[PDB]
Amino acid sequence: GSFTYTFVVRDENSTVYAEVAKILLASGQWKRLKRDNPKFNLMLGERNRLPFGRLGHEPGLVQLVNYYRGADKLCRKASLVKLIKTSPELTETCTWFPESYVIYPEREEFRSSFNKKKENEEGNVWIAKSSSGGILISSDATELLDFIDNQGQVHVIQKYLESPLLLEPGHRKFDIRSWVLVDNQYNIYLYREGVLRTSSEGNEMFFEEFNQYLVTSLNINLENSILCQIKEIIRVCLSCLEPAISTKYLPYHSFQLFGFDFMVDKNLKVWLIEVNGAPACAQKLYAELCKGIVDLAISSVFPLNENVFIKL
């Protein structure tokens, strides 16, 4: 026992891996090195284009990284579509994902699906969204398709939620931000603490005070409706990704923290918005969280001398 693991940091802008590098030395079993020192057990790397090529080569050196190469395939708005449209065991069972299309600055099935709604009298309000980049919430197809060419960024038109479930007082809108960790073995872990971001119609609601509104103002509960469904979309998007990201054969390990973003309507339904690959958190959590990313994700590979997570 009593080993001394190494590690480097190639992303300092990251507040989440800034807090871990702190808890890391917080056990004196670790030691940071130079940004370009190959001799590492762990690498807290950059948000974009991480050099997964120089990993696994050092002999007798096992390396864990905080990103799963290719999980951008779930974090790219665009790619998020291609992925669900492709996936057979999903495209059918997919009722929680706004019909979206990627217009090449497709666009065909767009209008074709736009008319069918204009000709059946019903909501026909969409929203234009950028890949990694501006947005627009229109109803005139052409007033959009002719607006994604002025951007030249390849966007995605998505069904806008006309009937959102609001909050009282203030009668404001909101979205929930989950937090999922996936270690080297591939065990999903949902951090019990989520967070609501709201506006005027903003604050920051927490699962405790939020579950309040869902009963003493409403007729239901936080897990008897929402959590049940969230714990599914998540489980499904990841299980559909497992094949293209499994490091089961590469010469190194990797884990990652994802940030799911959902929306609920008056019908009480839950929809998925986006998934974040390098999501940050809330200042009242950076502590209880970052400790998990080391308890569950890190020390699971590199041992040490010696209720917050759900495994889907």
Ligand X SMILES: Nc1ncnc2c1ncn2[C@@H]1O[C@H](COP(=O)(O)OP(=O)(O)O)[C@@H](O)[C@H]1O
Residues that bind Mg ion (CB under 5 A): 66, 68-69, 247, 254, 256-257, 301
The one of Mg ion, ligand X, none whose footprint includes residue 173, by CB under 5 to 8 A per kind, is ligand X
Length of the chain: 312
Could you say whether residue 175 binds ligand X (CB under 6 A)?
Answer: yes
Q: Are 187 and 132 in contact (CB under 8 A)?
A: no
The one of Mg ion, ligand X, none whose footprint includes residue 257, by CB under 5 to 8 A per kind, is Mg ion
State yes or no: 265 annotated in a binding site.
no
Task: Give the torsion sign (CA, 229, 231, 234, 237).
Answer: negative
Q: Among 55, 78, 102, 161, which residue sits at the site for ligand X (rule: CB under 6 A)?
A: 161
Could you say whether residue 178 binds ligand X (CB under 6 A)?
Answer: no
State yes or no: 159 annotated in a binding site.
yes
Q: Among 38, 56, 98, 277, which residue sits at the site for ligand X (rule: CB under 6 A)?
A: 98
264 token code pair: 């609920």
Question: Helices H, strands E: what count in the chain?
Answer: 11, 17
Cβ nearer to Mg ion, comparing 73 with 107: 73
28 token code pair: 């004196």
State yes or no: 187 annotated in a binding site.
no
Residue 159 pairs in a beta bridge with 126
Q: What is the enclosing helix (H) or strand (E) of 128?
A: strand 126-130
State yes or no: 263 annotated in a binding site.
yes
Number of residues that bind ligand X (CB under 6 A): 10
d(CA 57, CA 39): 10
Give the count of beta carbons closer than 10 Å to the beta carbon of residue 172: 17
Cβ nearer to Mg ion, comparing 100 with 247: 247
Burial pattern 117-133, b for ≥16 Cβ within 10 A else e, equals eeeeeeebebbbbeeee
Binding to ligand X (CB under 6 A): which residues in 235-264? Answer: 263
d(CA 261, CA 282): 14
Cβ nearer to ligand X, comparing 272 with 294: 272
Q: Among 160, 213, 286, 309, which residue sits at the site for ligand X (rule: CB under 6 A)?
A: 160
Binding to ligand X (CB under 6 A): which residues in 123-152? Answer: 127
Could you tell me which stretch among 82-90, 158-166, 211-219, 228-236 binds ligand X (CB under 6 A)?
158-166
